[PDB]
């Protein structure tokens, strides 16, 4: 077994083993996570 | 080149901001774009004008449009006025000195509401960025920020230091503890946006987008984990539009309570709060009515709960204004009458007086007592012209024509007209001619202050353009009937002379200063030049992608400029019709361009709210003027060229006058600081029987432990090898002290193991050498708990592996073939 | 938008909407102002000839050619009331949650995080509750709380517990919650729960690795003895 993408659409689950549910994110946190996803796809 | 600066600004009474009433009907404070105006209601004259400085057009002046005032709040006791701007800047103004005292910059968006605390020492500010910031006036700092909301703050209530209630555009009601800087309760006010919030004792009212109005009780001391805010009922106001503002006022003599709901439309709806005796009397009465209708007792109780709102509130009176209302405020509360003051979107101030007796008012409609109307125009100015003497400025707008004194900035005369489109002075500055959208041509005299002649059938459609010859005896008019008509002035009346019908509608008509050429703009994006003497066709200018809006001819009748909606200015040589250069001057449609007299330089205005100064020979933008808040509809230049006047969609007429430590090394500091504290406390305790740590608000143990964490894993071992053996002993003492804090122990057990145990590895020889008894007990201690703390983990995980294997085994027996 | 011929048309809700009947057997409710299909009702498997409305379309009757009547009743106001309430409750569940965390009421915070499915708050309730538990298993209240979970919830925890274990810094919490479950639940009942075994399958290989580690940490701890025997000489 290996940690993968979040099963629920409303959550972000990283390979670190941490699930990250949107409703409880702060706005600043969402921005950096969004930008973090930009970099990953950009290199992808 | 010379620099142009905004000499003066006028024509604005009340901009897009709230109104503040100050007792002496008393004076009123209203916003004027970047400036604030103080008006005397009785006289209707401007008392004073607040301007920060830095006039537009100066070198030090910023190259961006000024921030317009969004909210005005004044503390009556201290006479201190706070101004909120669209950029999120709060400026504290001294009313007596009329100067800025403080400047706060903590919001990234327009400020929506300002409120002084009761004592006047702290200012709470809400902005469109969804943030509430509480400022300390004496401290000149922002104490703290409240950030739970997710949209623009529409309204908030804070009369006590302990608690704050806030409303936002996202439609939640949030109760705050000012001591804890946290939101305690959150409730959905309405299905969509919540715009109004007003509080009186437990009674609270909020307005949504629809006519629904909610009524709540506030038990601040309820303290049941919830229910501090509980809904009572819903009442529907007559106006279907959203309610922007709600405020309360109480009568001291009779303890009577009133409020209004300011709607987005032209209606203000006032309400009265019934007294408790009235509510009981009504409740008993309606019970009699319901019982008479035969309703069951349980149905009556439910109906009473359903009609709970009706008992408390009474629709008192509805105020109707001719124009959409921008803001309103109570002025005076008395038994005899109730008075209100409002500002409209159409740039005027209206004072209303409501005489009333007991339950209902005496008059069917409110009494309009005072209006400040002379110094502003309701409709945006479409054309402006300057008299030859350069003393009188004519401003033509839809429905009215107003004329001002340039020196005093005061309107001299006002004339009622149709939908004004183009206006020009006649020679001598004593007459004005106006071209309306209805095809009518109007002539006025300043001395007579009346309209002499009107030509209803001057054109079948809008007279878009109107120009006069240098002699002033021949008038040229362009209209949507695709015709140009020439008129003569005979003693004064106008007589049609000749008709020049064109293939398309005409936008602009210009006559050369020498009266030799006539240039006309058509919707087909071509400009046609004619010879005025003989009306023979001369040239057909082509190259504009959108229709040409304005045409201007140089004083020498050599150069001609064309400005079109395609955002381009084209300079043409009239000798051969050749475009010398095409300039992408503005970011939007360019409405007007004018030559400076006796020079080829020219100005340009566009919908981007920017006026640009250009060189006709070098074709370069000399200066950019950023003062307009909206589209610039007309432009005019003085005959001498000393000053330029521009008017925009903001109802503003302004005059432009020519004037390090590394891993390990950081640790060594950490062990020194923390253990020095630890040893001191140990010595201090024994006898009984720093700034850095205090600033970080961490114990000595956490501080060093955190420093250990920050070190990268590849860099821990090299950092620790650098450590001298002396610092190892402090490290061992540190680890020993961690042992007592078993919470920290289990939190970072693997790291403590790795670092401690290498250290023993690296300098084992030196460590074993010492005979120190105190070291001998430390090593024995740290050993034992490290085993127990570690053994606890192994027991718990060595546990869960086994029985779960049993769980796996049991399922196989039942469900495995 | 009708696949087949439209054969009955009647305005409902006064001017605002239209209901239409097609030979396909589908009832489409359109917005007259926008001319767009707001809703589609499929209560028939054959052609429709007749359409009757009552109270401005509050009640609609459609008679299939086979002879089936579909009595449609308006329930929009019923639904939006339901939508309003659950949103109201969900907001309260949020508001109650962060307040408990600030107060440290982990036992109540745990149950709210069950319903709201907030993994960070779950890990934060469990993590700092453990720290207090350091200061039978966690605490009597939370230990009772974990026992009462229904099988839907039990699966949810062990999904998270599976996730935390894979990381070597969050596994201490993970085996840690798993132990208490085995203390306060019938191990038999756990087995039959569908899909639990597969989650229960993935948890061993990570735990067993954690035996290989930690156990080694004991081995290289006795350097303190070897230090402690040499010095004594």
UniProtKB/Swiss-Prot annotation, chain A:
Top-level taxon: Eukaryota
Location of the protein in the cell: Nucleus, Nucleolus
Purpose: Involved in nucleolar processing of pre-18S ribosomal RNA. Required for the early cleavages at sites A0, A1 and A2 during 18S ribosomal pre-RNA processing.
Recorded family membership: Belongs to the MPP10 family.
Assembly description: Component of a heterotrimeric complex containing IMP3, IMP4 and MPP10. Interacts with snoRNA U3. Component of the ribosomal small subunit (SSU) processome composed of at least 40 protein subunits and snoRNA U3. Interacts with the SSU processome subunits EMG1, IMP3, IMP4, KRR1, NOC4/UTP19, NOP1, RPS4A, RPS4B, RPS6A, RPS6B, RPS7A, RPS7B, RPS9A, RPS9B, RPS14A, RPS14B, UTP1-UTP18, UTP20-UTP22 and UTP25.
Protein name, entry field: U3 small nucleolar RNA-associated protein MPP10
Whole-protein coverage range: 496 to 539 of 593
Curated annotation (Swiss-Prot), chain B:
WD-type repeats, residues: 64-94, 106-136, 148-177, 189-217, 376-405, 415-445, 458-488, 543-573, 585-615, 627-657
Entry keywords, A to Z: Nucleus, Repeat, Ribonucleoprotein, Ribosome biogenesis, rRNA processing, WD repeat
Principal location: nucleus
Localization: Nucleus, Nucleolus
Family matches, as Pfam families: Beta-prop_WDR3_1st, Beta-prop_WDR3_2nd, Utp12
GO CC aspect terms: 90S preribosome; nucleolus; nucleoplasm; Pwp2p-containing subcomplex of 90S preribosome; small-subunit processome
GO aspect biological process, one term: maturation of SSU-rRNA
PROSITE patterns attached to this UniProt entry: WD_REPEATS_1, WD_REPEATS_2, WD_REPEATS_REGION
Quaternary data: Interacts with snoRNA U3. Interacts with MPP10. Component of the ribosomal small subunit (SSU) processome composed of at least 40 protein subunits and snoRNA U3.
Sequence similarity: Belongs to the WD repeat WDR3/UTP12 family.
Name of protein: U3 small nucleolar RNA-associated protein 12
Annotated source species: Saccharomyces cerevisiae (strain ATCC 204508 / S288c)
From Swiss-Prot, chain C:
WD repeats: from-to residues: 1-42, 44-82, 92-133
Domain of life: Eukaryota
Subcellular location field: Nucleus, Nucleolus
Task of the protein: Involved in nucleolar processing of pre-18S ribosomal RNA.
Subunit structure: Interacts with snoRNA U3. Interacts with MPP10. Component of the ribosomal small subunit (SSU) processome composed of at least 40 protein subunits and snoRNA U3.
Further remarks about this protein from its record: Present with 8070 molecules/cell in log phase SD medium.
Protein name: U3 small nucleolar RNA-associated protein 13
Origin species: Saccharomyces cerevisiae (strain ATCC 204508 / S288c)
UniProt lineage: Eukaryota, Fungi, Dikarya, Ascomycota, Saccharomycotina
Shown stretch of the complete protein: 573 to 815 of 817
